[PDB]
Amino acid sequence: MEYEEITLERGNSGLGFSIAGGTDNPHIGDDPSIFITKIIPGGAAAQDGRLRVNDSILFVNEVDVREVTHSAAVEALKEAGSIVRLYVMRRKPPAEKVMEIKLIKGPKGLGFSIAGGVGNQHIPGDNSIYVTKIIEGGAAHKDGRLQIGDKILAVNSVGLEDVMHEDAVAALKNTYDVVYLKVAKPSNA
């Protein structure tokens, strides 16, 4: 989570940015703090570009705008003047990405320890199938390269999270000598 103050002088008749939300009617539905949605490539806002739209103005013109209704936010900008020295908070970039790995079957199996699905989601709150242990010189070890920490949401087109640890386990082993597994990175890091 990043934080810092900045001055946005009215390039002319305004800064140029779209906001929405309010401590009463959150723009997302779970954040009393207001944030911006987009900036117009014209006003001083886009020119100053000292912040992102999805940020959270921790403070504006020395006014409490961390969890106040929209009307109060509009009033803050209404009495902002021109050179608004506001303090915003922009969270770091996420980390949600879907990978595609190749894992070949082996005589002793695929050579890896994974657990997901209902009944045994492995993780205390995640039906997704995550890995926990890998053998040496295994099929997935060398090919898959899925070190302890990866999580597969589906093998090519399988539902490794729509049955149970048993069905997902049987569905993973039921794969072919050479199957592509769909892995995913921990969103929001």
Binding site: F17, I19, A20, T37, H70
Partner: peptide, 9 residues
């Protein structure tokens, strides 16, 4: 939502 819209300022 329905009546209130974004503030472009």
């Amino acid at each position: 939502q329905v009546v209130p819209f974004s503030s472009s300022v």
